[PDB]
Amino acid sequence: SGVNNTKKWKMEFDTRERWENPLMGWSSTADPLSNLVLTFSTKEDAVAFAEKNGWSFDVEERKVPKPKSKSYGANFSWNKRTRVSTK
């Protein structure tokens, strides 16, 4: 329930094929950009960086928790279903 990793914008490349190494069964790759992950302060910085580097991008809007009305006294409601049967 920690929110400290949802604060910066990320740039990740599309994942390519990983196969099994015939000798050891390791995960092989031929994708140089499989681990490349860039971090940005805003969406605009990320799109500018992607555009000047010529990378086609899709960017999705940041999803933040909506504000919620929390009331401890609702747990003991006189006539509402918010009353809890256990605590």
Added chain:
Amino acid sequence: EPFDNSTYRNLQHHEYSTYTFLDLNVELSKFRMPQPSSGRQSPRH
């Protein structure tokens, strides 16, 4: 009638039974007011 602080006067609970309190409640249900209602039958309704 005279002052009698030389005797206990709480000897009734010596003859109480397992159902004395609940029988007293049963006989008390006679004269009570109608309970209030929250509208529903239970919070799960």
